[PDB]
Paper text:
The multiple inositol polyphosphate phosphatases (MINPPs) constitute a distinct evolutionary group within clade 2 of the histidine phosphatase superfamily. In keeping with previously reported crystal structures of HP2P family members, the structure of BlMINPP consists of two domains, an α/β-domain and an α-domain.
In the phosphohistidine intermediate, Arg-48 and Arg-142 adopt open-state conformations, neither making contact with the His-45 phospho-group. Unexpectedly, the phosphohistidine intermediate state resembles the open conformation, whereas the product-bound form of the enzyme exhibits a lid rotation of 10° (degree of closure 68.6%) back to a half-closed conformation.
Author numbering: 8 to 515
């Protein structure tokens, strides 16, 4: 199906959910924490559907459709996705995204039932955090509802009161934290901006200046944007809808559509039929966006295809859409090309990118720092037993590369021509950062002191990635052979830039 990073979240089956490894004897839960991307969402703005509608109107005028039925089908799919996004709101969570996080929060309580029941009895607290963006906060409140209905409401009174709540209403429980959940941009989702001179400002500012001005990234994206296999996929994909004469004139630069009311450059702001720009600002497109090639049209249609997978629940009633009919059979191979072009932009800008640099993923260091600092606060006598964070793909992708999670361990060649491809790299948007992708840490501890050292026993940590138990990077030594539990001291050592292990001292 090739949904790239619009892949809907696949929950663990009852076999996976009940086979998480048990901690070594004597250790019990003291803390858990998570970072999750927001769930499935609609279109970010009136763009892909708007531009293709302009192209469809031209092809209607010029007789460029292959048939009347094909054209009526094309127009009705476009009007359907646009109506669905207008009713749901552009850029907002869909019902599928709410269900994804509801289930994730349900299972989060079930996996640490002993910890949370004890916290309910003993005055422990739960911390909810968000980037500030509506999508992340709303995914959070659905997670929290699943958490509470799984626990029968016994933890509702145990929520830490934020000092900067996401909103006055249902997001009243969520602390805004753009320094660990939005570290990639100077401007924050809530309209504030990072403060010049602070480290969070420097991290976001340096990153944006790097990606904007790096020559290898731009050279590679230009190489992939002119790849002949992508161009042939574009033509064949559009060849099901438009006539070869229409496509020949588009490939010869005789056509061009801007995201305006008439398609021309001199048009004004284009807004989605039935939407209010004061309620729905994103329901109105940026006029600079255009379709100049077969590649643009094809990619816009592919984006409708993958977002339609996200809007499953909204696809009933009078205005339904069926974009998957354009990607059946051997056209699935064409979808593979478009998925690679989409993945490539993410790989080079937010993932491991090319070898010889760490600027694209070192921006995730504040979030890894907070992962370790909240553990430290808990072992040092704090009462927060859980921290649940909700952010974006722009948060998870560098975080996965920074830790070296499966799929984010291979950088592309330092070259503008020998570029990242599906043939030479494991990275895939659908597995690295699906919708509602999440990373969870469980932290256990053993009571008493460790005789022959004046100290308490080190806590141990186990990691779930999209609710799959995974080991840490290979440079890290686990507490025993074949184990996925790691001492906290070891992870402090091996997750730093040196990637050095503590050796025998990492073992229980
Ligand atoms: Zn809440
Ligand atoms: Zn609440
Ligand atoms: Zn660029
Ligand atoms: Zn093909
Ligand atoms: Zn062509
Ligand atoms: Zn053809
Ligand atoms: Zn309707
Ligand atoms: Zn780019």
């Amino acid at each position: 199906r090739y949904y790239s990073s619009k892949q809907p979240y696949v929950a663990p089956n009852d076999a996976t959910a009940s086979s998480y490894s048990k901690a070594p004897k004597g250790y019990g839960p003291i803390y858990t924490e998570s970072m999750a991307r927001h769930g499935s969402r609609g279109l970010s703005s009136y763009k892909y559907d708007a531009l293709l509608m302009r192209m469809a109107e031209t092809a209607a005028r010029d007789g460029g459709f292959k048939s009347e039925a094909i054209k009526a089908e094309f127009v009705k799919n476009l009007s359907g996705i646009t109506a669905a996004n207008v009713e749901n709101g552009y850029g907002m969570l869909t019902g599928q995204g709410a269900q994804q996080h509801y289930g994730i929060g349900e299972r989060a309580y079930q996996r640490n039932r002993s910890l949370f029941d004890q916290a309910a009895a003993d005055g422990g607290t739960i911390a909810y955090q968000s980037s500030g963006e509506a999508r992340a906060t709303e995914s959070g409140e659905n997670f929290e509802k699943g958490f509470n209905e799984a626990s029968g409401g016994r933890l509702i009174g145990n929520v830490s009161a934020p000092t900067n709540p996401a909103d006055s209403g249902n997001g009243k429980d969520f602390q805004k934290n753009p320094d660990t959940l939005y570290f990639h941009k100077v401007q924050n989702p809530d309209g504030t901006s990072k403060v010049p001179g602070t480290k969070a400002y420097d991290i976001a500012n340096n990153y944006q200046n790097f990606v904007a001005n790096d020559a290898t990234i731009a050279g590679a994206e230009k190489t992939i944007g002119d790849n002949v296999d992508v161009k042939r996929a574009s033509h064949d994909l559009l060849s099901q809808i438009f006539t070869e004469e229409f496509l020949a004139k588009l490939e010869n630069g005789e056509y061009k559509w801007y995201n305006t009311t008439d398609g021309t450059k001199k048009g004004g702001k284009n807004c989605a039929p039935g939407a209010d720009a004061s309620k729905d600002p994103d329901a109105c497109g940026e006029v600079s966006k255009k379709i100049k090639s077969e590649y643009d049209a094809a990619m816009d249609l592919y984006n409708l295809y993958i977002i339609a997978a996200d809007m499953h629940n909204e696809n009933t009633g009078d205005h339904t859409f069926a974009f998957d009919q354009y990607f059946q059979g051997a056209y699935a191979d064409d979808a593979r090309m478009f998925a690679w072009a989409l993945d490539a932009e993410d790989f080079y800008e937010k993932g491991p990118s090319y070898a010889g640099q760490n600027e694209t993923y070192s921006i995730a260091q504040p979030l890894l720092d907070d992962f370790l600092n909240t553990i430290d606060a808990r072992v040092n006598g704090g009462s927060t037993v859980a921290t649940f964070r909700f952010a974006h793909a722009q948060t998870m992708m560098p975080f996965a590369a920074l830790l070296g999670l499966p799929g984010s361990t291979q950088q592309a060649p330092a070259s503008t021509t020998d570029v990242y491809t599906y043939g030479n790299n494991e990275w895939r948007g659908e597995s690295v950062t699906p919708m509602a992708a999440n990373v969870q840490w469980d932290v256990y501890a053993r009571k008493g002191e460790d005789p022959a050292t004046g100290q308490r026993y080190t806590p141990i940590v186990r990691m779930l990635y999209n609710e799959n138990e995974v080991p840490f990077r290979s440079e890290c030594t686990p507490v025993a052979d074949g184990s996925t539990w790691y001492k906290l001291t070891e992870l402090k050592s091996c997750l730093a830039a040196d990637h050095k292990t503590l050796g025998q001292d990492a073992r229980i």
